[PDB]
Amino acid sequence: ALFEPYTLKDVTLRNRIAIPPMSQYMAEDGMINDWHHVHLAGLARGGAGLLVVEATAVAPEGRITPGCAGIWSDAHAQAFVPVVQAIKAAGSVPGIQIAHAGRKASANRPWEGDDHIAADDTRGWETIAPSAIAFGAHLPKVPREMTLDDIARVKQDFVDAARRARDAGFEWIELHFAHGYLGQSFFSEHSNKRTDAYGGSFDNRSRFLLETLAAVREVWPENLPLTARFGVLEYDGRDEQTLEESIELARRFKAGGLDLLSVSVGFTIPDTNIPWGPAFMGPIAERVRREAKLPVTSAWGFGTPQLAEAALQANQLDLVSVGRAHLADPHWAYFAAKELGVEKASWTLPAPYAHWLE
Amino acid sequence: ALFEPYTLKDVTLRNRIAIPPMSQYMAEDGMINDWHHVHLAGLARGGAGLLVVEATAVAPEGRITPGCAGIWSDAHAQAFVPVVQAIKAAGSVPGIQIAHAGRKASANRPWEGDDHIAADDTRGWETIAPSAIAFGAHLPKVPREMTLDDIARVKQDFVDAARRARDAGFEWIELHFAHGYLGQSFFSEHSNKRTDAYGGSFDNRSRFLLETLAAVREVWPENLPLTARFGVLEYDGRDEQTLEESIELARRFKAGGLDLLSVSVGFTIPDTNIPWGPAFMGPIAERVRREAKLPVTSAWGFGTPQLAEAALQANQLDLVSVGRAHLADPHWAYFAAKELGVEKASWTLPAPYAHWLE
Ligand SMILES: Cc1cc2nc3c(=O)[nH]c(=O)nc-3n(C[C@H](O)[C@H](O)[C@H](O)COP(=O)(O)O)c2cc1C
Ligand SMILES: Cc1cc2nc3c(=O)[nH]c(=O)nc-3n(C[C@H](O)[C@H](O)[C@H](O)COP(=O)(O)O)c2cc1C
């Protein structure tokens, strides 16, 4: 099942393996470089059906860190062009996740402190959010409360991002409404205390996300999968209530043209109890898939080929996302093909490798 | 031991893992391209101390196949420049093996027939050799017997190759006197029936190889390791006699400035009985190292980390060459570091990987 093709709109994946977006923190002023080119091209040659490029910021202040990729100008977009072309040459589908880190922005690289940049550090910048409330813990900076014009500008930033991604050749797009960044923070009552049209009720908290989806839909081709990542629960003790609302929004996403939902956890606040474990997201992903009638993917511990296979056969997922295993071994898909007994498994890789490994 | 550094002349390897030259058959008219760039850059990031670029032909007719890399012009050399730079950025030592396929030239890619190109095929070309004798089997073409001027031209080709490799930034060079190609074929009485100064006696059969070494030594920097690959036996039933002569030449190589010998089998003729097995070359490599008092490396089945480690501790080898395992997993060195219990093994890889795998 893991090695069956998958067709969504006009795009066909050679198998059900997806490489989720994985920030590399190697960009400079949003510009990617040979780090990203070799990293992504190598992964694509590895065998995976779909390769989703890391969170790429729609605006400079939307970066998580000073090393995050960006696409907030045509020059930033043009940098992706050769990389998209190499992904394609390798037979993998190029996707990109476009993002805005909201209140979690302006942080150090994970191996350089992983915390909010000091106030006197010339690399830092003011963060924006639905409300002037800090995440807390290692991210103590209070964001600036967004104005209506801020909301209009960020929405237009996402549209400009999607248009650039389209013109750079990406065949799959993913809106980053998860992991406690801007979009997610608009939906959660934890982070959104607004009293205008973008806060309060379910409809108001959904507005930013729905409006961003719709605006992007106007520039993104109808024949290329339009997707989003969304934290459907927080493990904050409000799980049944949050899940119900998240699934309702899923339905609205579907109605608004979303082709697939990447299902995750919110990470909106630090005060939570997440039951980490191999494929722990499976049951939750399955429920979203069932109740909103929407294809889904998820991640976390599916680097065990049998687990990925089990999730597919149980129809908990339509694609299995495999992250860290690909950082460890860019040729993981070949390893999975061996594990699962695929005929001529070495031909998961290109000929200059496959010939000698068969 | 596998993860101890190694210093040879002015060059220091971060560990004892070497990636042997592995032809990719993806070049066009000798020119390398993004296949090679991503392949080599990815391998370098994998952790290995030394990365030796595939057999690179000193002359067009010296290619094995129409897909082999070449360095017979300054434009060919300039193509290597960015790739050398990425290898270095990754902290691996860039080396290159320069070569001439002799009578085994003009062949199909291994996955496209692996045999001599048909006579009416516009891709093929006349092969040259010490004598007009075909390899046989799947390589039936009779080569043209080289003239003295042919020998002068090929020697100068190797010199021009070494100079280009130097100027492109390579820090390690390897002359390909193994595997039944030109150099090897000059040494073996099987392939060399000449009656001039380049055939007959031990001194005459050694002349081409020694003269090529000396000529290259004039352009190659004295502070960068100068090495060769040499088939020391054939398993043709003349093993003790061939090994003695090969070891004598090893001594002469050492006396002539060779810093390390990559020890292999001859593959000069097809009528042989090679005792393939995990690390089967170990004992033979050890003897060459001992009797010629020369550092050595070898390959074949050392993809088992414990085997590589054993060979080093037994002092059978100074570097362990690991080939196919790196085609399977470009991050093999990280896998070995885990297997062997290295402290902070994930930091065998660059930070954007290591941070998440620790
Ligand atoms: C290096 C790294 C960077 C990541 N960056 C992002 C990101 O840019 N966008 C995102 O939505 N998730 C990101 N993630 C989460 C992964 O997409 C994935 O959900 C997570 O690694 C769990 O899957 P795994 O167990 O296979 O690693 C990142 C994960 C890692 C390890
Ligand atoms: C894909 C491939 C291409 C190779 N090309 C060369 C070559 O260009 N020059 C050379 O001397 N040996 C070449 N070899 C031999 C390898 O350098 C090495 O000796 C062999 O793979 C045995 O080591 P291993 O068991 O780790 O794979 C090649 C091997 C492979 C698999």
PDB file of N, CA and C and ligand atoms in Angstrom, chain A residues 352 356, chain B residues 20-25 54-55 97 174 176 179 229 299-302 321-325 327, ligand 2:
ATOM      1  N   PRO A 352      21.865   4.803 -11.507  1.00  0.00           N
ATOM      2  CA  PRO A 352      23.277   4.753 -11.097  1.00  0.00           C
ATOM      3  C   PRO A 352      23.440   4.192  -9.692  1.00  0.00           C
ATOM      4  N   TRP A 356      23.391  -1.418  -8.878  1.00  0.00           N
ATOM      5  CA  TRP A 356      24.424  -2.073  -8.088  1.00  0.00           C
ATOM      6  C   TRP A 356      23.883  -2.647  -6.790  1.00  0.00           C
TER       7      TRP A 356
ATOM      8  N   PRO B  20      35.234   5.268  -1.994  1.00  0.00           N
ATOM      9  CA  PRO B  20      36.070   4.954  -3.153  1.00  0.00           C
ATOM     10  C   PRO B  20      35.452   5.541  -4.413  1.00  0.00           C
ATOM     11  N   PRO B  21      36.244   5.647  -5.482  1.00  0.00           N
ATOM     12  CA  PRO B  21      35.668   6.163  -6.728  1.00  0.00           C
ATOM     13  C   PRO B  21      34.562   5.237  -7.237  1.00  0.00           C
ATOM     14  N   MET B  22      33.415   5.816  -7.568  1.00  0.00           N
ATOM     15  CA  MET B  22      32.292   5.060  -8.089  1.00  0.00           C
ATOM     16  C   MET B  22      31.659   5.727  -9.323  1.00  0.00           C
ATOM     17  N   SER B  23      32.068   5.260 -10.501  1.00  0.00           N
ATOM     18  CA  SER B  23      31.494   5.716 -11.768  1.00  0.00           C
ATOM     19  C   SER B  23      29.969   5.786 -11.716  1.00  0.00           C
ATOM     20  N   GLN B  24      29.419   6.874 -12.241  1.00  0.00           N
ATOM     21  CA  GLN B  24      27.977   7.125 -12.221  1.00  0.00           C
ATOM     22  C   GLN B  24      27.342   7.014 -13.615  1.00  0.00           C
ATOM     23  N   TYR B  25      28.171   7.067 -14.647  1.00  0.00           N
ATOM     24  CA  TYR B  25      27.702   6.925 -16.014  1.00  0.00           C
ATOM     25  C   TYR B  25      26.631   7.960 -16.372  1.00  0.00           C
ATOM     26  N   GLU B  54      34.748   9.644  -8.914  1.00  0.00           N
ATOM     27  CA  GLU B  54      34.823   8.526  -9.863  1.00  0.00           C
ATOM     28  C   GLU B  54      35.933   8.621 -10.929  1.00  0.00           C
ATOM     29  N   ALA B  55      36.300   7.475 -11.506  1.00  0.00           N
ATOM     30  CA  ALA B  55      37.232   7.441 -12.633  1.00  0.00           C
ATOM     31  C   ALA B  55      36.911   8.554 -13.622  1.00  0.00           C
ATOM     32  N   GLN B  97      39.947  10.368  -8.967  1.00  0.00           N
ATOM     33  CA  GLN B  97      40.696   9.304  -9.614  1.00  0.00           C
ATOM     34  C   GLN B  97      40.742   9.595 -11.105  1.00  0.00           C
ATOM     35  N   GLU B 174      44.320  10.147  -7.343  1.00  0.00           N
ATOM     36  CA  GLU B 174      44.484   8.704  -7.427  1.00  0.00           C
ATOM     37  C   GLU B 174      44.611   8.273  -8.872  1.00  0.00           C
ATOM     38  N   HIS B 176      44.624   5.582 -11.691  1.00  0.00           N
ATOM     39  CA  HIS B 176      43.887   4.339 -11.840  1.00  0.00           C
ATOM     40  C   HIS B 176      44.691   3.320 -12.625  1.00  0.00           C
ATOM     41  N   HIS B 179      42.112  -2.763 -12.212  1.00  0.00           N
ATOM     42  CA  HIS B 179      40.867  -3.221 -12.833  1.00  0.00           C
ATOM     43  C   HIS B 179      40.927  -3.438 -14.344  1.00  0.00           C
ATOM     44  N   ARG B 229      45.678   3.353  -7.559  1.00  0.00           N
ATOM     45  CA  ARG B 229      44.963   2.111  -7.343  1.00  0.00           C
ATOM     46  C   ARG B 229      45.614   1.079  -8.244  1.00  0.00           C
ATOM     47  N   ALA B 299      38.903  -2.216  -0.438  1.00  0.00           N
ATOM     48  CA  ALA B 299      37.454  -2.242  -0.382  1.00  0.00           C
ATOM     49  C   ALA B 299      36.890  -3.646  -0.592  1.00  0.00           C
ATOM     50  N   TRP B 300      35.565  -3.727  -0.471  1.00  0.00           N
ATOM     51  CA  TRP B 300      34.708  -4.880  -0.764  1.00  0.00           C
ATOM     52  C   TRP B 300      34.129  -5.539   0.495  1.00  0.00           C
ATOM     53  N   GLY B 301      32.946  -5.081   0.892  1.00  0.00           N
ATOM     54  CA  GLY B 301      32.228  -5.660   2.008  1.00  0.00           C
ATOM     55  C   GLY B 301      32.564  -5.053   3.353  1.00  0.00           C
ATOM     56  N   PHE B 302      33.148  -3.860   3.357  1.00  0.00           N
ATOM     57  CA  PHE B 302      33.463  -3.193   4.623  1.00  0.00           C
ATOM     58  C   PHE B 302      32.309  -2.313   5.086  1.00  0.00           C
ATOM     59  N   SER B 321      37.792   1.766   2.702  1.00  0.00           N
ATOM     60  CA  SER B 321      36.964   2.258   1.597  1.00  0.00           C
ATOM     61  C   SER B 321      35.606   1.559   1.574  1.00  0.00           C
ATOM     62  N   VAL B 322      34.530   2.347   1.519  1.00  0.00           N
ATOM     63  CA  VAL B 322      33.154   1.835   1.625  1.00  0.00           C
ATOM     64  C   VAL B 322      32.325   2.365   0.461  1.00  0.00           C
ATOM     65  N   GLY B 323      31.946   1.478  -0.452  1.00  0.00           N
ATOM     66  CA  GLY B 323      31.358   1.897  -1.707  1.00  0.00           C
ATOM     67  C   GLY B 323      29.845   1.809  -1.761  1.00  0.00           C
ATOM     68  N   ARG B 324      29.355   0.599  -2.014  1.00  0.00           N
ATOM     69  CA  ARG B 324      27.940   0.374  -2.274  1.00  0.00           C
ATOM     70  C   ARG B 324      27.048   0.796  -1.110  1.00  0.00           C
ATOM     71  N   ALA B 325      27.543   0.645   0.116  1.00  0.00           N
ATOM     72  CA  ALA B 325      26.777   1.055   1.290  1.00  0.00           C
ATOM     73  C   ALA B 325      26.416   2.538   1.239  1.00  0.00           C
ATOM     74  N   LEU B 327      25.947   4.271  -1.671  1.00  0.00           N
ATOM     75  CA  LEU B 327      24.890   4.398  -2.662  1.00  0.00           C
ATOM     76  C   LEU B 327      23.542   4.063  -2.014  1.00  0.00           C
TER      77      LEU B 327
HETATM   78  C1  LIG C   2      28.717   2.114  -8.884  1.00  0.00           C
HETATM   79  C2  LIG C   2      30.134   1.627  -8.894  1.00  0.00           C
HETATM   80  C3  LIG C   2      31.066   2.235  -9.721  1.00  0.00           C
HETATM   81  C4  LIG C   2      32.415   2.022  -9.515  1.00  0.00           C
HETATM   82  N1  LIG C   2      33.341   2.730 -10.247  1.00  0.00           N
HETATM   83  C5  LIG C   2      34.693   2.586  -9.976  1.00  0.00           C
HETATM   84  C6  LIG C   2      35.608   3.478 -10.524  1.00  0.00           C
HETATM   85  O1  LIG C   2      35.208   4.474 -11.135  1.00  0.00           O
HETATM   86  N2  LIG C   2      36.951   3.364 -10.194  1.00  0.00           N
HETATM   87  C7  LIG C   2      37.384   2.311  -9.406  1.00  0.00           C
HETATM   88  O2  LIG C   2      38.589   2.128  -9.228  1.00  0.00           O
HETATM   89  N3  LIG C   2      36.467   1.436  -8.861  1.00  0.00           N
HETATM   90  C8  LIG C   2      35.112   1.653  -9.044  1.00  0.00           C
HETATM   91  N4  LIG C   2      34.193   0.838  -8.412  1.00  0.00           N
HETATM   92  C9  LIG C   2      34.652  -0.116  -7.336  1.00  0.00           C
HETATM   93  C10 LIG C   2      34.489   0.543  -5.967  1.00  0.00           C
HETATM   94  O3  LIG C   2      35.396   1.630  -5.850  1.00  0.00           O
HETATM   95  C11 LIG C   2      34.724  -0.463  -4.830  1.00  0.00           C
HETATM   96  O4  LIG C   2      36.024  -0.992  -4.926  1.00  0.00           O
HETATM   97  C12 LIG C   2      33.698  -1.603  -4.877  1.00  0.00           C
HETATM   98  O5  LIG C   2      32.395  -1.067  -4.869  1.00  0.00           O
HETATM   99  C13 LIG C   2      33.866  -2.563  -3.685  1.00  0.00           C
HETATM  100  O6  LIG C   2      33.567  -1.886  -2.474  1.00  0.00           O
HETATM  101  P1  LIG C   2      32.118  -2.059  -1.756  1.00  0.00           P
HETATM  102  O7  LIG C   2      31.910  -3.508  -1.377  1.00  0.00           O
HETATM  103  O8  LIG C   2      32.063  -1.198  -0.518  1.00  0.00           O
HETATM  104  O9  LIG C   2      31.044  -1.638  -2.723  1.00  0.00           O
HETATM  105  C14 LIG C   2      32.837   1.035  -8.633  1.00  0.00           C
HETATM  106  C15 LIG C   2      31.896   0.365  -7.849  1.00  0.00           C
HETATM  107  C16 LIG C   2      30.544   0.652  -7.992  1.00  0.00           C
HETATM  108  C17 LIG C   2      29.524  -0.073  -7.151  1.00  0.00           C
END
